[PDB]
Each structure stands twice: as C-alpha cells, then as structure tokens.
Amino acid sequence: DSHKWEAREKEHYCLADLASLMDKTFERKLPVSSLTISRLIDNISSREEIDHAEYYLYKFRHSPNCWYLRNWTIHTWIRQCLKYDAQDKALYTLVNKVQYGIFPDNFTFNLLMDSFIKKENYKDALSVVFEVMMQEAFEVPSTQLLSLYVLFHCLAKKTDFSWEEERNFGASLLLPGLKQKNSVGFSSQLYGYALLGKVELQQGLRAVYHNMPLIWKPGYLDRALQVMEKVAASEALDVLGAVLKALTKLVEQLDIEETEQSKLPQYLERFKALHSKLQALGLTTQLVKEKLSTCEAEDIATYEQNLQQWHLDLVQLIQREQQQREQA
Amino acid sequence: VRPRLIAELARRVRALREQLNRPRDSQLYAVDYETLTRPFSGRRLPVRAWADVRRESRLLQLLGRLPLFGLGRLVTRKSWLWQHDEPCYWRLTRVRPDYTAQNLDHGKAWGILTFKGKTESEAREIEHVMYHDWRLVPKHEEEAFTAFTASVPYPPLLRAMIIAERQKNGDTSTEEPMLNVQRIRMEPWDYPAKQEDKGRA
Amino acid sequence: KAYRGGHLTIRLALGGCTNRPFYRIVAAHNKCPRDGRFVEQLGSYDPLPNSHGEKLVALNLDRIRHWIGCGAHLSKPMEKLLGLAGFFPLHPMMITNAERLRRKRAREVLLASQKT
C-alpha cells in the first residue's frame, strides 16, 4: 500500500549540508527542529544514507528536543526502510526503542508485519510482535493479525521456551486477546494466562510484570479459570501446565493473603469441573485463518485523513520558518 | 562607607556558573547498583531503600518506552500500593526528559495526582520521580484499577480554666467546652510534597 | 542577630551548677545557643525533688499561649511537661514508655515466680 503515500511534497535535496548543519547545532549544544529531521528522512536514497539518518535520529533523541519526533517522520523512515532493505534496520531501531525514539504506535507496524509475511522471516516477525506488545497498542484490527502470527510461531516453537520467551508469549496472547466477538479470542486469552501462571509459579511474580503491560496482582491462574467459566456461562496446554505445577529473597505477598503454591489441588479440581461443564455444553490456527478470511474492512480513509493532517502541519511549520526568516 | 565590588563580582560569577555548568541530572541521579552509592556525590543510600533500589525502576525510565513519552497515562508508586487498599496514582500531562542520559531517563515529569482515590484540579510538579519505587498501569484493567467508593474534649487543665473564666463572667453553662477537628485535616506522611518548592543539588 | 529563617521554640535551659541541674523554660530562637539569649523567659522548672517530695514547675500559661499563637514550636521535654500539667495532652511517647515499663515489670514478676 505504497502509492497513496508517495506524494511527499518537495523540499531541498542536499543531505551533506543538512548533516553539517546538524553537527554545528550539536557542536554548539543548541536544539534542532523536527522539520529538519523530517526533511533528512525524506531525502535518503542509499543504505549509507539510511545509516546516516539512523545516527541523526539517535542524536536528536539525545537532545533538548527528544520530543517533537513526529509520527510523520517515523512513517517516512519506515517507508524508506521498506523501499531499501527494511527487515534488519527498522527491526534494530525498534529493539533499541528508547535510543532511536521511533515509537510508531500505528498502521506502520501492520505494514511491517505484512512485509514480513510476504518474505517469510518468522523470528523477526515474532520479535516485532513482541515489541508492539511492549508498546501500548491494540485499538486497531492488526491485533488479529498479530495473534495469527503468534499462533504460527507457536506451531513451530514447541520446546521448554525459557524465562523471557514464555513471558513474551503470554504478553502477546493477552493484550491482543480482547476479542469478545468470538471464542477463539477467549481461548487465546486463557492460553496466555496459563503461560503467565507457569512463569509466576516457576520463577516469581515480579518476573511477570517487571517490564510488561501486566499487573502485579497474584491471581493469574484464577483469572484464567474465571474467563473460562464466563465462556461456559455465555486448553490442552493449560492442562499440561497445571499438571506440571502439581508435580514436585523478598516477599510482595502478605502473611494473611494465602500462597498460590498451596492452592493447587483445589485449582486443578475447579479446572476439571469447568472442562466437564464445557463438554456437557459444547484448530486454533484454522480458526484464526477463518477470521482473517472474514472481517478486515481496512482503515484507509482514516489513514488518508491522517496523512492530510500531517501535510497541513508540515505546511504550517514551513510558514512559521519563513516568518522567522523574515523577522531575522 | 567602602564598596565591596569584588565580593559582588564573585557572587555574580557564582550565579553564572550555577546557571550554566549545573549538573544535568543524568550525572547526579545515577546509582552504582552493586555498591549502592552514587557518582558525583559519593555518599551511600539508606538501608531501607536497597532492595527497592535493586529490583524496581525509575518513573522517567518507565515512561521512556512509550509514544509521546506516555503523556496521557496512569502511573503508580510501589510504596503506595504496599501501604493502601485504595487506588493511589498520578496521571501525566508532561515530561521533562533529561537528554544527556544514554537510554533516556532520570529527569522530571508531572501531571494530576490522586491519593487514596481523591483527585485534585491543576497539575503540580510530582515528587520522587528519580526514586525506584514505580510501576506502570496498563490500559487493560486501567478502569478496573481505578475504582473508589469530628469533635474532641479539651485537655484537662485548659478546659477547667475555661470553665473558671465562664463562672467569673457570670453564666453557669453546663454545656462543656470542646474543640473540633472537622477543620483540622490529617493528610498522611506518605502523601507527596511539591517539586516547585524543593531545591536541587 | 540574623539567622537563616530559624523558627521560634519554647525550650528548656540549664541554669544549674554541676550535679544540680535546674531548668529555665524559655521562648527563644531555634538557632540560638542553649544558655545564650532569648525572646522572653517563661516558667522555671526544677528537676531535683525538694523538701518533702515535690518537683516544682513554674509556667506563665498566659504568655505560653501567646507564644504558641505567634508560631513557636515545642521541644519534646517541654511537650511532656505540658502534658503532665494537663495543659497539653499526654505526649504519646510518654505513654509508650510507661507501657514498656509496665511490660518490663510484668516480665520481672514472671521471672520471680519462676524462681520461686
């Protein structure tokens, strides 16, 4: 979805001069406008140039204007990356996050995901997904896509996972898992909860919430159970986890507040009961695929509007600059 | 009267120095984690913040992994959570991120507060921003997290004195004298102060 | 003398020789010395118990009140004294101390019982 964007509007097409200016600004320890950065981003037309731009971005991030790094600039950068290589450099930036200060909580992410899908690369995609999760996102319908990707990854990834990875997986499951419309979403959520529960029990409660959008409160297994029950009112992995748990420093929890390692048999029983109920009443990848096939009516008008707004803003900025020059 | 020009000049110079080469707080809010001391100053931290220092995070660092520097978000102090049943947090309206720090963190930030689920209009500058007792509140279960629903005797002698005075005046008045703490509020010790009023090193 | 905004304090002061402590309760500047100058002297306190077991304390309550109004803080001993008088409430620290003492006594009693 490229040709809607490629009316960028014209500016200066000399990068060396811009670079020099930037250096001078930094030499003096003076601030830099966002506009210049945007222009720089626009200009790029080589891998060396891309590298240079990256550096410049980093510098900006470490300056009196850490903020003002506008969405539009980020978008432009992403586009540039896509045009050239994309899957190493953008990813790297995302990983760095705080240093390049890119924070593209937008359709950019979706685009990136799509690109990744187009040229296989699974690990990278997973990483991207994780990064997105770490950022507070998931108002848009890319959530489904993310979930699908996660599922795909899981379909390959079937070992002991390990500390960070399990947590990441759980996070991925959870935040995109807000799909009240279908039982698949609920299942995903449950799975996520189970993973998180496992993490809690093996290692610690702090291990779960430390860096993630996740909440300190102890009952994760309980929460999962509740969620499951809700569905009934209106899994294998979870069972396995439970079984494992059953099989044979500071304290955030209280003396009165009961320890969840000493609530296991009861929990297991509850789970069993729930399962029975489900059976009485009455694959994941397939479901996800089906979902994908349905739905997906896009956000293109909105995107266009946003672009227009950005353009307007740019124009305003230019005008301001002109005024300043006149004054000078 | 002689004029002390030199002294004045010196003072001016000092002021200038303060204005200019003042430590951008990347330097002086740093922490060596293994020895639990500090660059620039050299002094240790107190014992009752060692574990906390080790295994939890700065506010600004937390913010640093968000778009717009998490300008429209909730955020909590771990201590508050430990202490109170009630929901206790700030929401942001601004960030002053100290740029000199590699992986941006440390500086200043602020917005609206609510201690024990009682909000305040207007945005102060918020205290304890460089402490390590902080946690970020996710947007999922944000509204789940934020859920909320007189008179005393005088001391022995004063009261007696008052009574005596009354008697002297003339009136008998069997109604006893009493003081009222409806006016006198008791904002707790863990209630935060204001960074506008404090001075930086 | 000009100090850096030192608050006012109603405080004790040693007016005694060695081994005879005698006290002077006094409204003074926080950053003044102990036996140095003051704003207005108030009621002298004696800690050593005089003839027939009295430990006498003066207080110009009328002027103490005035001082308090004018925004003069109280040192802990002063507060305790006030509490004792009935002018202030019993300082909770005193109460806690008393409790501790009681506990100690109880313990001692228990020990004695055990012995016997």
């Binding site: 500071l250 304290v251 009165i256 507040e257 | - | 009681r102 006594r105 009693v109």
Partner: peptide, 29 residues
C-alpha cells in the same frame, strides 16, 4: 490493631522485626 495492618507492617520490615505482646498489663509491683 486489625490483622491486615500487622501483616502490612511485617511485609514492610521483612528482615527487621520483633515478636510482640498484645496489650500491656494494668498494674506493676
């Protein structure tokens, strides 16, 4: 105190604590 408060206190001062009585006596020989 209510037990919750006590628990909280304990949590706060994990390593540094003392075992205690409830109320004190009401006499002292």
């Amino acid at each position: 105190p209510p037990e919750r408060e006590l628990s909280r206190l304990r949590r706060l001062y994990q390593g540094h604590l003392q075992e205690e009585s409830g109320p004190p006596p009401e006499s002292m020989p």
